[PDB]
Design an enzyme around this catalytic site. Sequence first.
Site, mmCIF file in Angstrom:
data_model
loop_
_atom_site.group_PDB
_atom_site.id
_atom_site.type_symbol
_atom_site.label_atom_id
_atom_site.label_comp_id
_atom_site.label_asym_id
_atom_site.label_seq_id
_atom_site.Cartn_x
_atom_site.Cartn_y
_atom_site.Cartn_z
ATOM 1 C CG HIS A 127 -17.913 -37.340 39.698
ATOM 2 N ND1 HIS A 127 -17.418 -36.363 38.861
ATOM 3 C CD2 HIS A 127 -18.218 -36.719 40.863
ATOM 4 C CE1 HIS A 127 -17.423 -35.202 39.493
ATOM 5 N NE2 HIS A 127 -17.904 -35.391 40.709
ATOM 6 C CG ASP B 287 -14.803 -37.481 36.303
ATOM 7 O OD1 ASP B 287 -14.414 -37.411 35.118
ATOM 8 O OD2 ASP B 287 -15.448 -36.566 36.857
ATOM 9 C CG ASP C 190 -20.555 -36.185 47.462
ATOM 10 O OD1 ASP C 190 -19.491 -35.909 48.055
ATOM 11 O OD2 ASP C 190 -20.588 -36.595 46.285
ATOM 12 C CD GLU D 4 -21.224 -40.062 45.414
ATOM 13 O OE1 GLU D 4 -22.400 -40.427 45.200
ATOM 14 O OE2 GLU D 4 -20.603 -39.289 44.656
ATOM 15 C CD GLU E 287 -22.845 -37.024 40.451
ATOM 16 O OE1 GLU E 287 -21.828 -37.586 39.997
ATOM 17 O OE2 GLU E 287 -22.868 -36.458 41.568
HETATM 18 MG MG LIG Z 1 -19.285 -37.489 44.715
#
Ligand SMILES: [Mg+2]
Lengths: 403, 404, 404, 402
Positions: C324, C297, C221, C247, C344
């Site tokens: 996310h 998200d 990430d 990411e 995740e």
């Molecule tokens: Mg991320």
Amino acid sequence: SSVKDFPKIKAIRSFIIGGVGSGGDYHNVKGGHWLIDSDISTPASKWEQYKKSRTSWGINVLGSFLVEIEATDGTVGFATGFGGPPACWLVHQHFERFLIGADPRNTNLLFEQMYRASMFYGRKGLPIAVISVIDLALWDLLGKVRNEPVYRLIGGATKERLDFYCTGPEPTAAKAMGFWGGKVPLPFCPDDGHEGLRKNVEFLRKHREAVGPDFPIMVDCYMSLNVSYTIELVKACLDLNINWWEECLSPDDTDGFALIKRAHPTVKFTTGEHEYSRYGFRKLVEGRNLDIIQPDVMWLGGLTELLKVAALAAAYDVPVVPHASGPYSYHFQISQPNTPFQEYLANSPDGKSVLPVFGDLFIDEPIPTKGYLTTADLDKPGFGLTINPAARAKLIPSDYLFK
Amino acid sequence: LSSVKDFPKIKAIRSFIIGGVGSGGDYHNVKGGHWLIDSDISTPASKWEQYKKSRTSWGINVLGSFLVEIEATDGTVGFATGFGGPPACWLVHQHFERFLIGADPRNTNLLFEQMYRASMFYGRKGLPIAVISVIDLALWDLLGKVRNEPVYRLIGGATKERLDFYCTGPEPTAAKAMGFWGGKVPLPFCPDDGHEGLRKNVEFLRKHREAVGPDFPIMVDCYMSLNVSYTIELVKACLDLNINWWEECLSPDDTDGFALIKRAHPTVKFTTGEHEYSRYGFRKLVEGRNLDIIQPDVMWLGGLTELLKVAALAAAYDVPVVPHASGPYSYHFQISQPNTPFQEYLANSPDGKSVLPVFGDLFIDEPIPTKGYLTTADLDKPGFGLTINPAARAKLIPSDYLFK
Amino acid sequence: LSSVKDFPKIKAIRSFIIGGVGSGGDYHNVKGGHWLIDSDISTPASKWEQYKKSRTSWGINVLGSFLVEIEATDGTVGFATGFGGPPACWLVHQHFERFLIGADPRNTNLLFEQMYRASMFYGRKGLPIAVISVIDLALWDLLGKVRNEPVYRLIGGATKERLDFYCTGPEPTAAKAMGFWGGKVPLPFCPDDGHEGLRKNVEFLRKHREAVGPDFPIMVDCYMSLNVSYTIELVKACLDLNINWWEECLSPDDTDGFALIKRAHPTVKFTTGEHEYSRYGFRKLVEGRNLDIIQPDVMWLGGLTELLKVAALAAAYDVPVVPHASGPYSYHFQISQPNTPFQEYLANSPDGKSVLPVFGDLFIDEPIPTKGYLTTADLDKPGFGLTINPAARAKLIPSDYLFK
Amino acid sequence: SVKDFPKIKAIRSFIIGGVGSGGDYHNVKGGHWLIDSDISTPASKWEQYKKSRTSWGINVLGSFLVEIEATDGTVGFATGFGGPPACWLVHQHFERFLIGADPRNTNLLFEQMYRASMFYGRKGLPIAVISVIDLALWDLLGKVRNEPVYRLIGGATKERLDFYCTGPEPTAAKAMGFWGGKVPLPFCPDDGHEGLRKNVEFLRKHREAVGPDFPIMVDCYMSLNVSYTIELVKACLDLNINWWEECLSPDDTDGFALIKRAHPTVKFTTGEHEYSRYGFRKLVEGRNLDIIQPDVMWLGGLTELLKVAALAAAYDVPVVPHASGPYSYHFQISQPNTPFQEYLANSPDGKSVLPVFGDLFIDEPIPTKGYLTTADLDKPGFGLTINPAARAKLIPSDYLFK
Ligand SMILES: [Mg+2]
Ligand SMILES: [Mg+2]
Ligand SMILES: [Mg+2]
Ligand SMILES: [Mg+2]
């Protein structure tokens, strides 16, 4: 010993402007004003209960706010914009940490820090409007410390006279007052079907007849149309010789202009008042499908970022004509190579007279009562705006938001 | 209105040709023996045997340096130096002076646009633009002096408190020892030397890599002397040497060629720009994003006013701008923008083992990165902080004779 | 009508600010020491020393969490949490409440279009959209409660009976031990740390690869902190580490840059999207197919209603959507679509060695992937199946004060 | 705990006997304009297949009905075209994925049927079969929950649904309250320049009959080509045609890039003979089509249609399904980008509104006034109840497996 000991930032204060018609929020006005109570096509016109008034769906929800930045020497710079309470909250909770104790001449640094630090919830919209006003307050401070107008600090005067066009329901008034052109708001949205399209055509035809064959007429669509409708409407108005069509599409679909230009390559289109940052504007210049980009200085990120946006546009000879903005735009337009003229958003309820863009918040806002302004009109420290001492009573400290 | 500072207007402009060598803006008008002109360096003229051994043979030092002084009505004088010599001075007075006399020096945008568009019929790029650049720098020096502020404090402030430098020269081990973060060496042989030359270039770079170790960044300057196919084969032959970046591999006339170079080596960095001009010239280097860094020379591209616009365009695409070593003119710029990460220092010592003033003895207080870096404090002087050496005054030849 | 269910209308909406830290939708508003804010993590602000050691230093935790409750005329209450705090609550009542009171909660499409289009003049992306997202989620929670069905059974059913997770945190060996299929670690240094920082980043990843073995999937990430050139060089330097995917390497403002990244590394996977919003924002991430996975998200992009549309567009190009974190709001979504392969889980333990509730003690029954997976059975509760912790209600601060 | 939803217990299929009943719009009695008027089609190239659409087999499949019964006795159903071969496929292939499944797993069931039939499907007949099954699942879901399908897929984005009328009499459409009239193009490219002038005169007559303001659309039933379309549209520019529908074969949607180059200010539509989210993504790419028009009973069903509309919505491209009755009404009333509905005039002379599915159902909501409201759609599932009288015409598909 060798150079000036510039004062640093000592404190920052924010206020919400009580009432309406005062401050940076153009649409937080009294009922009856054409800005909110006339037929205007908007993104919410699709729904009957949000069709007759722009306040019905909340165009005036945020309100205006003011930011003051005081340096160690006592000099105070300030600016206003829309954002109200939420904006003031962010000013202190998030951005103040970057300002206190900083050299105000570090405009590039301060902007990058505020922008990148708020990237997780910003990049566009409200947060950027907050950064914009803070940045404008910094420039006002820099001008006042040096005792120079802001325009003399960002390139000087590329022109000695600034010509304005007037946005409002009465183009004949604009013409009579000296404005070089008049921009009218489109009254009906696509959802009104062909009936609305014909009414839109009649509305414009009437104006063209009223001002004569030569007076430039522009049409503002307040991000309310779509590609198919825009193409059909423009085609239906070809004999009216419209100067340009503004913000026909949602700011989320600037890609659509490639399609509009494919259909009407000899017609001018503009947009940008609801776009933000140098990254947002690079896409409006890419492809050169927009004849003019129109960021709002109090929304896109501020003067610092605007200077960068104009420079990119200048490399492609694309003109930058900011959305309203008053002195914040006047100082900018008078100083760049690619900022040909200025917009004045008629702030009189009937659009027949010129009143201060920011209402009674300031006492000396220069107004184009004759359709223009000159560098002399801008020869005051900073942005040249003096807060009306009588308006202080209306300035509500943002302290209550943290209780 | 009386409500604001009454700024002095431009009263006069003077120009001088700098006598001798080693002083002024012309980096290459130096004494024989200097690696800058007498070491093996691949150039656009290396194709011909009689112009392969030295850069002066074909005229890299033909123009010389010149100085421009702009005096305001209050007596304040701003100045700047650059290359262009006699012909540059001729243009300063014959063409550009008309736009300057009586003007407010703060009108940098207007003055630049007038000089540029008025000389468009014989300019746009090259010598004429270098003239405009020096005049623009003189204006900024004047502005800083009238306001009693360093130029960097007038163009965005400090985005960094320390400026880190990489050193360009034939001795990267010296660059490493002095504190520079990296070393850029000049490629010795051109495409016309064939495959033998390519092998010699590879061996040249291999030895430098071995000398500085596997971690010290090494960059290669090609002085617009290669071509697409040769660049592709050379880069391929050097992959194991871990070159940081390849600079100005192609002629400035073929920036479109980097699309072909990137197709072959998309994981390798390429830079260029020192011989490109105006915001219109640089928009091309950013388009397509085939260049990892653009490197305009502040004294050549059009000046600081135009450079600010070039940097802004690049910033919208996060392309870094690292000017071709221009002394303080570049230092004040690099320390002030969001996309100006570091600075170049062109080793001006004959053997490239020490750091000497970029403009020679023309000035007495040029800040030098003897430790491989400079700080904002080093730049805290009015204007560009350069004070003419009174001893050099005697070398300043008035340009008057050119009009007799 | 008399032939179909008489569905209750929206009666009222309430909002609360979640006091303290470690509870609510704001993942980064946690206690000091938590790796999420106090470990070495490259961020957009890492360019500046005073902001590189702590993510809270520059304000990652400035907003805080808030809760929205929507009560129907039958007394049923749906709710949801997210980050946004005070400013979010202010907007809920000042702007959005007008579209909700008296409305049929089943009109999810209408309500979203109204809130989104009515706030475009100051929204389209960021905070305003986060507000709309939480309101939408509260609407879905309400719909599930009224019908006595889990949200996933209302949006397509179960396309799988088990949801497999990968673990995001500083200890991939723990993720492996706990049953997660892969581990995603945060990149420690930004581009401004130069080649030294790059070498350190490589060593960091090498250490993890060494620790988990050659087969365990490791993702990296980058929290929108790099740039095109740096990303290309870093990926090249880590080729032998067999990184599964990289990411959010670039700023959300430059998704166009992935075209350049893919030109250099076409066999390497890249992902992004947690900081992108609306169907209009995500259409760009799918165009060109330069991203192997998009990661919105659910509490930020616009809500479940808009997320369903984003996933459908991606599905037409077989581009997987792996949101996310998001807890149950994401679990119900991932288990129901054709192109949502896994989930995740952001290790919320201070050391990243154990799994704890994503929303802290706000709820008493949050389903957690202690074994690296969840099942449809785990989601079989009305709405989003989250029950507010009575002890947390005292911590709920009515937003009323913001309007005094 | 949560609701214990009934699982699928069984599935039954029926062929609808006779004509004028069921989902096959074109399986009607002779004389109906739908099959016996001058209409340009892909087979108009040949004289023997020029006069009637039935001559070349537009009515060859017929209609069929699918019934899905849950363990609680609730039964959802839907009709479409496909006839005997459709019924054969329902039981021989797709039944295996349905029995014992939770009907709420619409996404899973669709993906399984589509991917499992990929080797002989992706487009056409097999997809029409999946579509009807999917529609039957949604009818079942609404009935179990006692809610209209539109309340299950986003609610109402509008309270009123305005229709335009497709048929040979646009003056009748105008008189009945429809906002516009779409007429069928009479001659194909093979009739040469003579046919082109007649097409122009045909359209001019309609424009003059309804006036300059009433919207007139032109349906070309995938029978033209790029060059011909460009010439025809150019010759009709003064007629202010609202949009030109399905000018090209579904095999050449790439051709619209060429058409748009020539006529960028003219609207073009297509899609009734396109299938799946993969098929429609191409119609959205390039944005050369102003409206995409899938048939809910052919493209894959409601589940897939929701995804197709979502992709189009990301580009603000409107989705206006081809006919489809309630299967399309419930969809149009619930999405952000579904502006209006089409009503294919089913009266033989096109001057009156008759049920889209004939006498198969007893309560089909009809737009006799040119519109429908949410109240008209407030019935469980798709709100269609089988006509007891029609039950006799429901032929069990059993004979196909003997
Ligand atoms: Mg991320
Ligand atoms: Mg406007
Ligand atoms: Mg070089
Ligand atoms: Mg059709």
